[PDB]
């Protein structure tokens, strides 16, 4: 089962901190027997509306295939806890 995960990182993020965050969350999405088919970054984009008082966001796209959704659930839990990712969504296909 495929999954496309889109998430947004806050615009006042340092380069190294953002790199560490993206890498951590890609690894999280890869952990539970889930193979990351492909992850990419669409850069910093203007948000159609302010989220947490932010007019911009670094957009990360990831595609991962798995037989379950433990990786996706862990990603969403840690994204809810995180104060560095503003928005996230997982689409089946």
């Amino acid at each position: 089962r495929t999954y496309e995960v889109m998430y947004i990182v806050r615009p006042n993020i340092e380069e190294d901190a953002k790199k560490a965050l993206v890498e951590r969350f890609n690894g999280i999405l890869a952990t539970e027997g889930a193979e990351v088919l492909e992850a990419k970054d669409w850069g910093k984009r203007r948000l159609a509306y302010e989220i947490n008082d932010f007019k911009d966001g670094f957009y990360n796209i990831v595609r991962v295939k798995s037989d379950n959704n433990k990786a996706t659930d862990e990603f969403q839990r840690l994204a809810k806890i995180s104060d560095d990712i503003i928005r996230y969504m997982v689409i089946r296909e």
């Binding site: 889109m6 947004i8 948000l47 159609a48 509306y49 989220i51 966001g57 928005r87 969504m89 689409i91």
Partner: peptide, 11 residues
């Protein structure tokens, strides 16, 4: 509605 949620498009 997906795009609106992801802030790609406005409400």
């Amino acid at each position: 509605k997906r795009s609106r949620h992801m802030a790609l498009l406005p409400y």
